[PDB]
């Protein structure tokens, strides 16, 4: 007793919210519940794509190392995404995470040089701090202004152990020499589901400004800003975990009553 | 009934932070499943106010009838109800006792919060739900909450003197901050466990006593695994996503050892 146009909206909402590395499982659940593969393919096509761009899904392209991220910044319409490192275009199936059709592509050599020096120095940083990390660096014009967008993804999927986790960084550097405007979002998400459903969601906005020079010299400085900002974030997380554990948790339920012993139920009943 | 299994599987994957709003939608999506979902999907407990005796009570599906809820204090429905599901006068008396018992239990382990106990009649015995909600203080920088949902089943044997208890317990644990250091951080959700035991029903050891011991054990055992999962496991996962100190060539290399190994 709710409109079919609404039902698909809910189904779409559910899909977009699938925990990291559990898209399939959520999708199957949603499909079987809606019971209308016709509604799904229309009113939810938007959701499959949005989720992948939202989650910075890494994908292997055949004959290339290494992987590239599916973001909104690589979206070219059609169903094609850009790999700025290899300067190639490729097709993507959002349902089965498949990268077909490697196609040489021409980059706007406006920023090419700045982009390479970042993509280069960020590669090294990712390698150093993200065990299973991937990154993709874009260089494109936004409102007449040259922007460099660095995206980092790192995940650990262990469905057999009923837990999954993912880190996503998005750093935007709008470059207006002699200054650059830094704007970032850092996201963490962890899902544990052995005999329950426990999740950590956290994000941090970061905003900063810096003085620029030569492309190589400030690519290096960009990375330092990233390193510092992310370390502080991970530290803050670990510090907050500490506080949560030995302060606010202890304050919710005691471990034993103030009598340092288990409850005498006879006393309780008279 | 394969439908329900999907809904419940979905509920264990969608972020527990939006349990209430998601269940609302899930039911709209599959209205036939409503009655079933409402009884098998746990939600953060709400507090209502029994205006008659002036005391708070907790709300779940087991004291709901229609859109009204039964206060364990005045034994009446709110908003008032024509013909609502009640307990037999025999059971009501045990209920009122179980509420007093678990009220003390609450005080003993939580030093505050709210508890409510609802009993209902079964076939060869009875069932109960024990609810406890405790909130942390707005003095400290971190919001916290603890919801306990213990559902017990009692199957009395024909003799008396011995009975079989089935306990299904869920604890929902919610932690959250806007400390500028880490933006927003919400760590929430729940765990569920099962105990199943036979025990002596004497005068020195009645039903409430038997149920109590079971609850106490489970809650102590969960409090433990909670601490270990919330502040142990989920954190380690975080730390396995990113490392502050630059990754040491040893793990970098141990990792290549295993990556190469996984060749189809």
């Amino acid at each position: 007793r709710v409109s079919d146009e609404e039902k698909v909206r809910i189904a779409a909402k559910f899909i977009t919210h699938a925990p990291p590395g559990e898209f399939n499982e959520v999708f199957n659940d949603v499909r079987l519940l809606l019971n209308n593969d016709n509604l799904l393919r229309e009113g939810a096509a938007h959701a499959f794509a949005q989720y992948n761009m939202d989650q910075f899904t890494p994908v292997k392209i055949e004959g290339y190392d290494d992987q590239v991220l599916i973001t909104e910044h690589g979206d070219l319409g059609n169903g094609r995404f850009l790999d700025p490192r290899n300067k190639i275009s490729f097709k993507f199936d959002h349902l089965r995470k498949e990268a077909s059709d490697p196609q040489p592509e021409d980059t706007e050599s406006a920023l090419k040089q700045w982009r390479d020096a970042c993509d280069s120095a960020l590669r090294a940083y990712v390698k150093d701090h993200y065990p299973n990390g991937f990154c993709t660096v874009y260089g494109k014009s936004i409102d007449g202004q040259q922007t460099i967008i660095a995206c980092i993804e790192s995940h650990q999927f262990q469905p057999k152990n009923f837990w999954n986790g993912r880190w996503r960084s998005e750093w935007k550097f709008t470059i207006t020499p002699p200054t650059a405007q830094v704007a970032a979002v850092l996201k963490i998400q962890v899902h544990y589901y052995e005999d329950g459903n426990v999740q950590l969601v956290s994000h941090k906005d970061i905003q900063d400004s810096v003085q620029v020079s030569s492309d190589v010299q400030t690519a290096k400085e960009f990375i330092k800003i990233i390193e510092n900002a992310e370390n502080e974030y991970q530290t803050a997380i670990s510090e907050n975990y500490q506080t949560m554990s030995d302060t606010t948790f202890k304050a919710l339920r005691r471990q034993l009553p103030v009598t340092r012993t288990k409850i005498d139920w006879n006393k309780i009943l008279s | 009934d394969q439908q329900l299994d999907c809904a419940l599987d979905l509920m264990r994957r969608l972020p527990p932070q939006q349990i209430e709003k998601n269940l609302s939608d899930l039911i709209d999506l599959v209205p036939s499943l409503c009655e079933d979902l409402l009884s098998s999907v746990d939600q953060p407990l709400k507090i209502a106010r029994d205006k008659v005796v002036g005391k708070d009570y907790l709300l779940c599906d087991y004291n709901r009838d229609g859109d009204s809820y039964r206060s364990p204090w005045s034994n009446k429905y709110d908003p008032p109800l024509e013909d609502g599901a009640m307990p037999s006068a025999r059971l009501r008396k045990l209920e009122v006792e179980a509420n007093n018992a678990f009220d003390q239990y609450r005080d003993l382990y939580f030093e505050g919060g709210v508890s409510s106990v609802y009993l209902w009649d079964l076939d060869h015995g009875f069932a109960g739900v024990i609810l406890i909600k405790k909130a942390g203080d707005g003095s400290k920088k971190i919001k916290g909450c603890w919801d306990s949902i213990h559902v017990v089943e009692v199957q009395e044997k024909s003799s008396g003197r011995t009975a079989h208890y089935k306990l299904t317990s869920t604890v929902m644990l919610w932690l959250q901050t806007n400390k500028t250091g880490s933006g927003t951080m919400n760590l929430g959700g729940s765990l569920t466990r099962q105990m199943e035991k036979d025990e002596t029903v004497s005068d020195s050891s009645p039903h409430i006593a038997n149920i109590g011991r079971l609850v106490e054990d489970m809650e102590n055992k969960i409090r433990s695994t909670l601490n270990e999962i919330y502040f142990g496991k989920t954190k380690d996962i975080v730390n396995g996503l990113r490392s502050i100190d630059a990754i040491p060539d040893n793990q970098k290399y141990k990792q290549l050892q295993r990556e190469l190994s996984q060749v189809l």
């Binding site: 898209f23 399939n24 499982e25 999708f27 199957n28 499909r31 593969d37 799904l40 393919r41 349902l95 089965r96 469905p159 057999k160 009923f162 589901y193 005999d195 | 329900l4 299994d5 419940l8 599987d9 264990r12 409503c34 009655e35 409402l38 009884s39 098998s40 999907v41 746990d42 599906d61 087991y62 709901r64 009838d65 229609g66 859109d67 013909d83 609502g84 599901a85 209902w120 079964l122 069932a127 559902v151 089943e153 089935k166 299904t168 869920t170 569920t192 466990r193 099962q194």
Partner: peptide, 29 residues
């Protein structure tokens, strides 16, 4: 067009709340 996607958890996730005692309401929600 279309598909039933491959999960790799092996075991179905088991829902403990199913086997809890049911309770008969005198009207539905």
């Amino acid at each position: 067009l279309i598909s039933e996607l491959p999960s790799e958890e092996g075991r179905r996730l088991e829902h403990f709340t199913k086997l809890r005692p049911k309770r008969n309401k005198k009207q539905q929600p």
